[PDB]
Amino acid sequence: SPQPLEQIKLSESQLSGRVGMIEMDLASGRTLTAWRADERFPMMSTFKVVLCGAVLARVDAGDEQLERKIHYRQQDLVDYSPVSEKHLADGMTVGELCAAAITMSDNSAANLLLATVGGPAGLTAFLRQIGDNVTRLDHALPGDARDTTTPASMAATLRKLLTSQRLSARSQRQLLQWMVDDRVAGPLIRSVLPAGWFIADKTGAGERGARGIVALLGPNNKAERIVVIYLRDTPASMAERNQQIAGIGAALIEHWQR
């Protein structure tokens, strides 16, 4: 593979789309690679990690419990509810809702959780409170800033949730574990990663070719770096979008020591 930046450029050329990317040391926030890092991209399902960060902040504050059982009705379900559709009789705990939202991208779970943090306005206020003045949730054509972030903002926000003292030790540990447990792409990624490489992640997909991943990655079985990659405005097949992101991954892996 070529160098990371060379591969990012090749991916834009092949996809006819915009790629946005940050590679960041998790412990320190050192930025290693930045490409369109201040440009806006649709977050898609990647917002679910930030959502559950806000849920954990309420738990830490004494205003929520991960144990608390939420009962919901079939009429409350929205499109794509692979876990939540199974619990109409018995409900789900707030913690289970977060696990379903992050690890399965369960939309009904995310919707229920979003209500608890005061909707999109409430989540946006949470972001402003932790110093993210860029990311916004309002609920995919160009010029629409709704439900968007930048690679730099998302990376900084994820770092703050995972490592700063904004969340309790236990809550940091929980948020990381939900990402380790991703079922959408985690096992697939492991299957193609060389031995010794740690992965935790949340994926996203959307209209007009939108595709993305927020991940922790590193050799020696350590979450050494945050990697955020967003694609937008490409007509490419999902398989091709996946392959291009994987290719950027390969360039990082082959050329890690920078």
Ligand X SMILES: *C(=O)/C=C/N[C@@H](C(=O)O)[C@](C)(COC(=O)CCCC(=O)O)S(=O)O
Q: Check residue 242 for interaction with ligand X (CB under 6 A).
A: no
- Indicate if 108 belongs to the active site: no
- The verdict on whether residue 191 carries a ligand-binding annotation is no
- The verdict on whether residue 48 carries a ligand-binding annotation is yes
Tokens 């398989």 identify what position? 239
Nearest to 18 by CA among 157, 203, 212, 155: 212
Are the C-beta atoms of residues 148 and 43 closer than 8 Å to each other? yes
Rounded to whole angstroms, the Cα distance separating 162 from 172 reads: 5
Q: Which of 8, 51, 184, 245 binds ligand MA4 (CB under 6 A)?
A: 245
Q: Which does 19 bind (CB under 5 to 8 A by kind): ligand X, ligand MA4, none?
A: none
Q: Which of 5, 176, 180, 253 binds ligand MA4 (CB under 6 A)?
A: 253
Q: Check residue 51 for interaction with ligand X (CB under 6 A).
A: no
Are the C-beta atoms of residues 201 and 213 closer than 8 Å to each other? yes
Q: Which of 116, 157, 203, 234 binds ligand X (CB under 6 A)?
A: 203
Per CB under 6 A, which of residues 174..213 are in contact with ligand MA4?
189, 192-194, 199, 213
Q: Which residues of 203-230 are buried (b: 16+ CB within 10 A; e: fewer)?
A: bbbbeebbbbbbbbbbbeeebbbbbbbb
Residues that bind ligand X (CB under 6 A): 44-45, 79-80, 105, 107, 184, 203-205
Residues that bind ligand MA4 (CB under 6 A): 1, 189, 192-194, 199, 213, 215, 217, 227, 229, 245-246, 249-250, 253-254
As annotated, the binding site for a beta-lactam includes 48, 105
